[PDB]
Amino acid sequence: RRETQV
Amino acid sequence: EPRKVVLHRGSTGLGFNIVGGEDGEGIFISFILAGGPADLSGELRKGDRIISVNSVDLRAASHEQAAAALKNAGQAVTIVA
């Protein structure tokens, strides 16, 4: 479900 | 029309999540961090698509591909969305 904080 | 939003990372990074890249469908701002460089710029909102980081294209980029690019974009990250 991939979501990344950047 | 896309924007050239230059950011600067803090102890929070650029201040926004991303989603997509999961199939060539592109990267999209998934959420803005209150106080973060993104938030404060008021030039990027939940939903915006990331076209490129520091001249590097991310339209077809995969998730980790955008993740990493953003991650080592330097301290002066030039974002196009």
UniProtKB/Swiss-Prot annotation, chain A:
Full protein stretch here: 153 to 158 of 158
Name by which UniProt lists this protein: Protein E6
Motif (PDZ-binding domain): 4-6
Location(s) in or outside the cell: Host cytoplasm; Host nucleus
Summary of the function given for this chain in its UniProt record: Plays a major role in the induction and maintenance of cellular transformation. Acts mainly as an oncoprotein by stimulating the destruction of many host cell key regulatory proteins. E6 associates with host UBE3A/E6-AP ubiquitin-protein ligase, and inactivates tumor suppressors TP53 and TP73 by targeting them to the 26S proteasome for degradation. In turn, DNA damage and chromosomal instabilities increase and lead to cell proliferation and cancer development.
Residue pairs linked by disulfide bridges in the UniProt entry: none
Organism, scientific name: Human papillomavirus type 18
Family: Belongs to the papillomaviridae E6 protein family.
Coiled coil residues, start to end: none
Note: Belongs to the high risk human alphapapillomavirus family. The cancer-causing human papillomavirus E6 protein has a unique carboxy terminal PDZ domain containing substrate.
Quaternary state and interactors: Forms homodimers. Interacts with ubiquitin-protein ligase UBE3A/E6-AP and thus forms a complex with human TP53. Interacts with human NFX1 and MAGI3. Interacts with human IRF3; this interaction inhibits the establishment of antiviral state. Interacts with human TYK2; this interaction inhibits JAK-STAT activation by interferon alpha. Interacts with host DLG1; this interaction leads to the proteasomal degradation of DLG1.
UniProtKB/Swiss-Prot annotation, chain B:
Domains (record comment): The PDZ domains may also mediate association to membranes by binding to EPB41 and ADGRA2 together with the L27 domain that binds CASK and DLG2. The L27 domain may regulate DLG1 self-association. The N-terminal alternatively spliced region is capable of binding several SH3 domains and also moderates the level of protein oligomerization.
Function: Essential multidomain scaffolding protein required for normal development. Recruits channels, receptors and signaling molecules to discrete plasma membrane domains in polarized cells. Promotes epithelial cell layer barrier function via maintaining cell-cell adhesion. May play a role in adherens junction assembly, signal transduction, cell proliferation, synaptogenesis and lymphocyte activation. Regulates the excitability of cardiac myocytes by modulating the functional expression of Kv4 channels. Functional regulator of Kv1.5 channel.
Record text on subunit structure and interactions: Homotetramer. Interacts (via guanylate kinase-like domain) with DLGAP1, DLGAP2, DLGAP3, DLGAP4 and MAP1A. Interacts (via guanylate kinase-like domain) with KIF13B. May interact with HTR2A. Interacts (via PDZ domains) with GRIA1. Interacts (via PDZ domains) with GRIN2A. Interacts (via PDZ domains) with KCND2 and KCND3. Interacts (via PDZ domains) with KCNA1, KCNA2, KCNA3 and KCNA4. Interacts (via PDZ domains) with ADGRA3. Interacts with KCNF1. Interacts with CAMK2. Interacts with cytoskeleton-associated protein EPB41. Interacts with cytoskeleton-associated protein EZR.
Modified how: Phosphorylated by MAPK12.
Name assigned to this protein: Disks large homolog 1
Tissues expressing this chain: Widely expressed. Strongly expressed in epithelial cells, in the small intestine it is only detected in the vili. Expressed in brain, heart (at protein level), muscle, lung and liver. In the brain it was detected in olfactory bulbs, cerebral cortex, hippocampus, and spinal cord (at protein level).
The family this protein is said to belong to: Belongs to the MAGUK family.
Domain PDZ: 4-81
Shown residues within the full chain: 462 to 542 of 911
Protein's cellular compartments: Cell membrane; Basolateral cell membrane; Endoplasmic reticulum membrane; Postsynaptic density
Regulation: induction: By BDNF.
